[PDB]
Structures are given as C-alpha cells and as structure tokens.
Write a protein that binds this ligand. Structure first.
Ligand SMILES: [Mg+2]
Ligand SMILES: [Mg+2]
Ligand SMILES: [Mg+2]
Ligand SMILES: [Mg+2]
Lengths: 190, 188
C-alpha cells in the first residue's frame, strides 16, 4: 500500500497548513490569527463568486488552492523576514518538488504546473489570483481592526497594496472596503 | 453590487473563526476552523482520482458544503438538533447568504449546497465521504500531537461502515492500520 501511504503523507503535509499562522498577523500581535489554509479557502470562494467570463474559473480556484501550498514546509515567509526573492523561490520550488513527489505522476505534474503558473504571473488566471490574494489580505486586515475596535491599526498592509489592483470586479470590492474603512477612521479620529 | 458582495465575503470570513465543534467538545487545544476543514477536503477532491466523477464539481461542493456554518455555527450530534431542524436552519441560512449575490450566482451557489444536502449525485456522495475521511485524519493528527493515541476513538466509531468509494476506503484502511499500530505500541 505504498500508494495509500504516500497519499496519506501528502495529506498530513497539507494538514500542516492549518497550523501555520499567517505571519503578517502574528508580527502585528493579532490575537488568534488565521491559518494559511483559511486564507486559501476564502480566496477559492472569491474565485467562485467573482464574475469574469474571460477567465477559466476552474483554473482560478485550483490556483488559489495550490499557490501557498509550499508553506507547509517552508513556513509563511514575510517581507519583514528579509529573504531575497530568488532564495524564497528556490525554497518554495524545492518544497513543491518534495510535496508533489508523493503523488501519482499525472497529479504530481498537474499540481506542480499549477504552482509554476502562479509563480510565473503570465496567465490571466494567475494575475487574477494574485489580486485575490492581496484583496483577501486587506479584507482580513479590516476584519481584525474591527474585531479589535482599533480602526486604522493595520494601515501598513493597505499602503503595501497601493496601485496593485486593476481587475474591474476586485477594484469595486476594494473601493467599497476602503470607503467604509477610511470613513470609519475619520469618524474615530473626530 | 459590491457592498453586498463585501458583506457576503465577510460572512464567509466568519468560517475562519468557527472552531470545529467536535474538537472543542474533546478539549483539543487550538482546534481547526471550519474553513481549514473545507480547504483540505477541496485539496483531497483534487488529488483522489476517479475520472467518472466531475472533479470541478467535487471541489466546489467541498467549498460550499459547510458554508451555512458561518451563520448557524458548526452543529454537532452532541447538540441534539433534530435532523429536520438542522436542515431547516441551514437552508434558511443558505438563502440569507446567497441572496447577497447576483441572481445567477445566487441560484448556482444555492443549488450546489442543495445537491450536497440531497446526496443524490455521485459527486455529493463522494464529498460526504471526503468529509468523514478528512475528519478521522484530523482526529489521528490531534492524537499524534498530544501523544495520546486512541483518545479520539469515538470519531472513528462514528464513521463505521460509512465508506465505500474504493480510493477513500484504501486511504481509510491505511490510516486505520497506522493508527492501530501506534495504539498497540502504547498499550504494551
Ligand atoms: Mg505567504
Ligand atoms: Mg497567499
Ligand atoms: Mg459541521
Ligand atoms: Mg464538513
């Protein structure tokens, strides 16, 4: 039963994503921060409910579910960790090779190529998912601010996404989030 | 449009903060969320092979099946909610949740949930087995982390005879054998 054993080892590695807290929240003292799998779950849902008939939605959902999968080995590397982008890529690529080698060859190839597609940021689906990633993050940031009753506290996350959104539907979402958020901050400040 | 979609996504976000109830009831420290549970199920639908199943449908079913819990919470058998009442409450919640979406998506998302609740399609029945399989996998993982093998036996007992898809059966059999070996090692 080497096949079943390998699959089980694969699913245990995947399960480690539940126990990897998202690093940016930890570094900002968020109580009970979300896991990497929480982050990917809402991104996948976003891909299902944001309309764009030019995009292959199935591909978008799968990219969302695979894009941070290397984190079960590498951990969630944050800008504050000061890891060179090429070193981060090397670590993540090596981790993805180790993870996918536990799968039958068709699925090994598929899962790896999906991760590669996201990393490459060429396809429209990959670029769309990158925007979902950033949108999900700033949405989560405002949710923590609200839960804490500390509006504006996580402003650094918003600043870091300046100019990064361009998809028509995502842009409407972010604008509505920012209008609500900025108005709340102004009211709290006065 | 956007304001209601944002409300929808915030509701979906509540799933990150709903701990899976069975683990809470068994004093598991730092239990997984409902969204953690669905995430791994979705990955399982991606990597467990059966070309007679619509895999895209399986993934989507996994992502929607417990979505009503963002409003009603994760109801457990311990909670003693009649099956009919649990369905009534979840149905009500899915209606409330999906009415935040444009007509086409509202219908699509609600019908996905309904397919799962109905358990008619082969995909729905497969995802139901993924649900139970993911659960007992997580139970073994908690036992391992605690170094208390056998402690969460009840979750295994509750799944007895609920598996029949050959790939899922093989995975469950391997899990069971690895676990029982650990339990035997702790016993002597
Ligand atoms: Mg990361
Ligand atoms: Mg991400
Ligand atoms: Mg439940
Ligand atoms: Mg479930």
């Amino acid at each position: 039963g080497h096949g079943a054993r390998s699959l089980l080892q694969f699913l245990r590695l995947v399960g480690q994503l539940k126990r990897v807290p998202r690093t940016g929240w930890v570094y900002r003292n968020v109580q009970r921060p979300e896991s990497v799998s929480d982050h990917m779950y809402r991104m996948a849902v976003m891909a299902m409910v944001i309309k764009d008939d030019r995009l292959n939605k199935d591909r978008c959902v799968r990219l969302a579910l695979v894009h941070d999968m290397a984190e079960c080995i590498v951990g969630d590397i944050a800008p504050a960790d000061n890891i060179p982008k090429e070193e981060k890529h090397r670590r993540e690529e090596e981790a993805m090779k180790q993870i996918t080698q536990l799968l039958p060859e068709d699925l090994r190839k598929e899962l790896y190529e999906l991760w590669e597609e996201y990393e490459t940021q060429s396809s429209a689906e990959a670029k769309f998912v990158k925007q979902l990633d950033q949108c999900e993050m700033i949405l989560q940031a405002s949710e923590y601010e609200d839960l804490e009753h500390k509006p504006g506290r996580l402003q650094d996350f918003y600043d870091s996404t300046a100019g990064k959104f361009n998809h028509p539907e995502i842009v409407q979402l972010v604008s509505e989030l920012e209008a609500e958020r900025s108005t709340n901050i102004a009211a709290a400040a006065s």
